[PDB]
Amino acid sequence: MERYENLFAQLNDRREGAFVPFVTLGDPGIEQSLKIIDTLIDAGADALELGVPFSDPLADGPTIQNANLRAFAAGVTPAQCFEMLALIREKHPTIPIGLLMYANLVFNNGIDAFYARCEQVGVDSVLVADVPVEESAPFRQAALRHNIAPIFICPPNADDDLLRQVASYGRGYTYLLSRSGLHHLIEKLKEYHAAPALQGFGISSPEQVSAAVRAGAAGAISGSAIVKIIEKNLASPKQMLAELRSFVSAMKAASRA
Amino acid sequence: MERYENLFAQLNDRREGAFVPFVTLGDPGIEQSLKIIDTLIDAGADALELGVPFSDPLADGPTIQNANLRAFAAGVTPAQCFEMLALIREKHPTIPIGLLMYANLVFNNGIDAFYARCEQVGVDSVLVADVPVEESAPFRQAALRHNIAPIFICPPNADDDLLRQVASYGRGYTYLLSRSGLHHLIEKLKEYHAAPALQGFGISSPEQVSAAVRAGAAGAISGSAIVKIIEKNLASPKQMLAELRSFVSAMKAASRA
Amino acid sequence: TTLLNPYFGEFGGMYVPQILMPALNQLEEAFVSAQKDPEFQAQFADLLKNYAGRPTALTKCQNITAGTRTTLYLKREDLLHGGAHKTNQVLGQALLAKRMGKSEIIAETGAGQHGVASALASALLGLKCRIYMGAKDVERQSPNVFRMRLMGAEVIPVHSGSATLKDACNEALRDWSGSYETAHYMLGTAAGPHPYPTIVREFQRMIGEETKAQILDKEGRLPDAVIACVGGGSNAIGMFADFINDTSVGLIGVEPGGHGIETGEHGAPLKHGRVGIYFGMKAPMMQTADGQIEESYSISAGLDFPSVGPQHAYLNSIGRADYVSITDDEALEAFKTLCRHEGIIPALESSHALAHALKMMREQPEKEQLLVVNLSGRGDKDIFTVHDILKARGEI
Amino acid sequence: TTLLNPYFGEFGGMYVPQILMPALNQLEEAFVSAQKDPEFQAQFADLLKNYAGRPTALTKCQNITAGTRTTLYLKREDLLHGGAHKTNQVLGQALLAKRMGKSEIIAETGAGQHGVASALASALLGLKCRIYMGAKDVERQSPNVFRMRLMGAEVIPVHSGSATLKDACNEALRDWSGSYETAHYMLGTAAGPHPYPTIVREFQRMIGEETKAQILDKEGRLPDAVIACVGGGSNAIGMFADFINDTSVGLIGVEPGGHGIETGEHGAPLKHGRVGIYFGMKAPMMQTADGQIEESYSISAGLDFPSVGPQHAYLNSIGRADYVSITDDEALEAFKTLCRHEGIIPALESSHALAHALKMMREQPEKEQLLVVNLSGRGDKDIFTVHDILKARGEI
Ligand SMILES: O=C(NCCOP(=O)(O)O)c1ccc(OC(F)(F)F)cc1
């Protein structure tokens, strides 16, 4: 499919940025997570980034570490995540769906088989957090053979060789990091015909979405801010969804011309 | 004085051995110790060997270690021991009195001064347990200047040089050890004109006294056996003295022709 | 692109987030430079000799082998300053950090030994050291925590995840990704992403180099086998490296068998795990059927890394080295045996290596063989562990 | 009559019951013979090198002395097998016991270190070792007791007297007087009756011999002073002996000052006691006005001998060596300082020596001086003692 290409062309026609929430699949349980995701979409999410719970998420801060723990408390497994993904795609045929994976879960039963399963359930992209471009070949190749976009991170200091590699190897979008653990990066990515850039890390208010789009990014990704709302409202699921709806509506509105 | 020479000449006229009890001065207290000593004499002790309590009696087994501890529990000091000795001599003008000392108590305030104090209270001999003949010169010299007999141990294996040294250096009697931690020793001591031999260590029954005298010794010394009787009867002082009287009478009777 | 090969056959690599690649590349460049620099080599050698106490003895154990045709030597890393081999490589890494102009050290620790080694190197060399330690380990290893603090290190309890070694490792890497301009990550074994498996081997290789010279001096020939325990792989690769090209010399690595391989409660991923990608590398690990990383188990906390250095996986795959396992009880028996017969209290880690040598001897007592065991550390730290077990099961 | 002089001026001698003289004479003869025997010397040297780890390093401590004109080296007896200098002389004494045809060893211990050293030497050399230890010490030193037992020694609690070191010493001597035909008494310091002060010095003198060669190599001159703690005197005389005839080299012995000399709670008989006769020798001791032997006190149990070796009393009397004291708090500060600034955890005993060197430096920081401290042992054993004090007084 070409779901990201279609989205970005449609947003460009509307002079509009993408707003892309991240959540952990199965946080805080399978059924509430499905409701959370439907609420994110109904509230205006342009695409989704979805984490599969992993025992040791090195690239994640405490908020998302805790989201993974909550999902593990509910017994969530990768197989259950793929069952969820199939249901999500069945309900929502056009929204781009990207996974955020750690390498072991992709490599475990075979890299090809992982990307084959992504294609089968209707996933559009995979970002493997701990595979740098230098190690990426078997991943990006398997991705492309199964019509999955391999997503790469472009760190804030990327030298020129790295920019060119990310531009060549990525598809779907380029994940532009706000920081470590800018118009120069954005223009160079465009010069090298990279996939459109989505800014992520630390995006938690409407003005940041507008700023990202003004800097020339195609949109913004927000995770910890969304997951915080989950964490805050564990005792009241209904208020959780209302607070999520309110947050996403505001972030998406900031992306519109 | 010549109290040992007088005793041994008198016993020899009666074809009789000496029986010599050992006790710790001030065990289990000063007044009971004075009574114990009067009872030993009345019951037939020919001479006394008397220990001054010392913090670390290396040459002593557990029975006498405990006698020292009891005396320390009663606050007994060397000064109090010398006060006791003066009273004993005042009551009993002819009985030979020997002390069993450790070196530090003799050296502490000056070797000469120690032997001068012995002479003043009427002590007849001193055995310093941890001064071998090799270290004995200042001790035996000070002893002799104050008319005190220096007593030496003759161990069971004494080679010929040691026998000759003990014979030359000792006075009063020769302390003949029954064992470590015999007619050859006795005859050689007599050949070298040694002070008469008293056998000690492990002497606890009448037959041992008779045997010692038959082997040619001038008598026998008994300590732990006497001190055991004290230890056994701490709760009944009166029975203590009766049991001591009975034990000493029996041991002394075994020494008679 | 790298200066040196990041792989040993299939195994190894640099499986870290993109943001950490510049730190790894910087470190590789610094290391390649230092290895060619006679001044760096001389400074390292000087610290090893005059501070740490190298060379370490090679001790013949004739009481242990009585009545057999085995001759056994122990390479005495238990006599190294700090009481374990870890000191060698922390000194090298501290010098590298200084070469790169860094004033700060980050380290992870589980049992606390690497923490203590990192702390002493940092104290000596004027580096500000912070150590990540899982909160369960902090609570479990009070003596080592207090040593680290005495030596001026900041000990940071990690309450996240399961609050053990892998969580400390992750917290250390998170910190480094933000601080690598001024802080060096002093990884504690011959594992993790390139260039660490290579750096740690090179900064431990004096173990085998000395052993070779000492055995040639004492016996006029090379060993039939050199035997080392394998937690992450550093003491073993340090012993092995100089002998790899001596094809007659057996290289035997000993993983912890815990309660027994068949119980699943063990620490032997190399022979009983499955290849995965974690800890920045492709290597055998302890993992679920699903790919979640699970724990090692051993009586010896120092052998709890649930994976293994990639060079060991490679040496096994080609048949150059052989890997075996030893149970808790076998290790305990070897510990008791050394204490009684040679007056040397071995680390429980090292006791696994010794236990395997004892088996080689006992199983075939008329086999003529010359064996060296790497005695990777001293076992003063283990006497309470050993006491409590012996008491619980009735003896003593 | 003896082969060698039993006295150092007034001090020393053989003040034992007559029954023990043949044991002492036998031992003296055996020692004089062994010292002339190149085979004995070679066997001893071989054990020292290949089992114990000699030579020990001489480590320059430049962080400690920063900003001053003091250059400080530590002689690293903390790196010796067993973690203290005591190992040197027990190996020599075990070889002497074998030379005399004995199969059994008797030893005394207070803090347990000499017990552990005697046990490891006996395990190595095939001797049946029994160790006397006051019951209060047994209860107080569980870790060392279990080490001794692991190494096959029989540990015999002494409940008599005050159930501490002097009672253990007495029980050991009682046993020996009956068993000396088949058992050797392995006395643990350079004190007691002749020939022990001489034997123990000679079997520790490699400390100073190495230090001399190492300092000449590293500085091209001798030290201005060598500084050692003094409990009974063995590590100090071992450091001092080779320098006695180098009249420019200061010899500084450090006794424990405990809570302060003025409190009476200390362990400094050499400078603050009175000559007496006890422990088989004429020497300064801690005693009442009446002559009863009293106790030392120090934070460091290893410095609790309430007397001192006679050669130290003699070297003091002629002005060749100088003796000073260091309090518990000064020792604690030196312990903390070494840990933090050099990454070396010193025994609390050795910390007394270090504390005095620190004072020499701090009191006169522009005085140019080259100092060696004998770091007689490692301080892993003291970390709980140090922790508990620091906790009790608020810090940490
Ligand atoms: O999208 C992610 N998180 C959600 C957005 O960040 P935030 O809103 O700050 O939680 C996200 C993306 C990549 C990642 O790993 C690595 F960078 F290594 F590839 C970790 C988290």
Ligand SMILES: O=C(NCCOP(=O)(O)O)c1ccc(OC(F)(F)F)cc1
């Ligand atoms: O007379 C003594 N004890 C009493 C008699 O012995 P026993 O009846 O067995 O207690 C006695 C004599 C000497 C001695 O020390 C040494 F031998 F070294 F000089 C210790 C005890």
Ligand SMILES: O=C(NCCOP(=O)(O)O)c1ccc(OC(F)(F)F)cc1
């Ligand atoms: O085993 C490790 N360290 C040893 C700690 O030693 P100790 O203090 O004795 O537990 C260890 C630490 C980090 C690592 O890689 C990565 F950083 F990526 F996670 C791999 C192994």
Ligand SMILES: O=C(NCCOP(=O)(O)O)c1ccc(OC(F)(F)F)cc1
């Ligand atoms: O200090 C002594 N031993 C050291 C024990 O060392 P540690 O185990 O560290 O207490 C010590 C032991 C015996 C001695 O002489 C004598 F045997 F006559 F009593 C003098 C000093």
Ligand SMILES: *Cc1c(COP(=O)(O)O)cnc(C)c1O
């Ligand atoms: C840490 C440790 C080990 C295990 O680590 P490796 O990297 O596998 O060598 C082994 N022995 C001792 C004494 C240790 O401290």
Ligand SMILES: *Cc1c(COP(=O)(O)O)cnc(C)c1O
């Ligand atoms: C026993 C001990 C001492 C004290 O004994 P000396 O005979 O006076 O040397 C000093 N340091 C250490 C480390 C010890 O174990």
Ligand code: NA
């Ligand atoms: Na492992």
Ligand code: NA
């Ligand atoms: Na002393």
